[model samples]
Target: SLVVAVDGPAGTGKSSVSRGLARALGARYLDTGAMYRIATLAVLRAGADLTDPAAIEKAAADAEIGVGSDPDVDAAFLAGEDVSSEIRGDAVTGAVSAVSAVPAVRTRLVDIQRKLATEGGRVVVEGRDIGTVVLPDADVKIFLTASAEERARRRNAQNVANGLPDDYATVLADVQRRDHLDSTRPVSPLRAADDALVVDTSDMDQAQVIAHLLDLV
Candidate 1:
């Protein structure tokens, strides 16, 4: 298996970089973040309590969360329906961290993620725990990072591109909130693996980030 695991917090440009890397290398791209987003949307739709672990687990298991492994197609599906936009909404983004922290949900999704990577043969996987938890022995591991301010700026731009108006202040707050939750989570906290390469993208643009990743891989 040829796996390039890209791990990072939200708004670090992991998703976009991973997709470009995958397409450039003619490999499959897996956006593991979308899986959690799908689950968050599903749990909310089911009216499940976020504080209740069992409720969240059941919601995850029952929901048909589908994430495409193609880099060219930016989409996520829920129960065979296209929910690409829905999963990226404020509602899902706000709840994804809590839902993703549930051990049961992680276990269930990680199993599927691993299977997809192995089956696909050559995959560029992007997620919070890809290097630390999802694929510890991945052929190549990259931990992308950026300043909170830079990430917030990028996130705000992305939101606007997606037709969701955003302000820098609110986006920065959301980014910080996610960073804290992800770093302090009990299961598979956001941290670079021992042998992974860390790239601080605080001053770099997409082209620079992609160049570094391409060279690494």
Candidate 2:
């Protein structure tokens, strides 16, 4: 069994690339960031004060979060309700940084993440901190990235495909905001592991990135 950790900021194709890699390798796929997103959704549903760390932590802990590992199905469950799409919506995107920055929230989710990775034989786990925190000893660690403009362009396209608003400037600002929040957070800040391979996908297509990762693996 092999464990591959893929870590990067938002809009870096982490989810799609990891899923593709997992399917190609006949492995399970984990989107650890989705966990955080769903947790943020929980906090929102609870109407917790975004400024209060304790409220955020409690809401995150009280909610039940589960994510499917099959690369073919990217599903996230919140209290037994499938919220795969909801977690990716604008509300979750806006508040996820604050919710996930809570130390308690990260501790709780990281425990589940570690358990899932340990039990999931031949797994490809992707998140901002997978390589640096969740599974530092993973067999292959990849840090995927693209320029801010490139990332925003990709994200805007995704939003349009999903029927969301398609404003490039807003999307780019959000991407930059998340980049700062994710990198500056006190716990599990996003960064590549010391031994991880860094891939800049600014000029690469999805297939190209996947093939390159496969070669590395």
Q: Go through the candidates in order and give the C-alpha RMSD of each one to the true structure.
A: 1.6, 1.7
Clashes of 2: 0
> Which residue pairs in candidate 1 collide?
none
Q: Write the per-residue lDDT of candidate 1 for residues 66-138, one digit (tens) a residue.
A: 8887899978999899999788777897898789879899999999998888985689999878898888889
Candidate 1 lands at a TM-score of: 0.93
Residue pairs that clash (backbone atoms under 3 angstroms), model 2: none
lDDT of 1 at 133: 88
Residues forming the 10-long window of minimal summed lDDT in candidate 1: 181-190
In model 1, which runs have C-alpha deviations exceeding 4 angstroms?
A: 183-187
How high is the lDDT of residue 31 in model 1?
91
Score each candidate by Cα lDDT: 0.87, 0.88
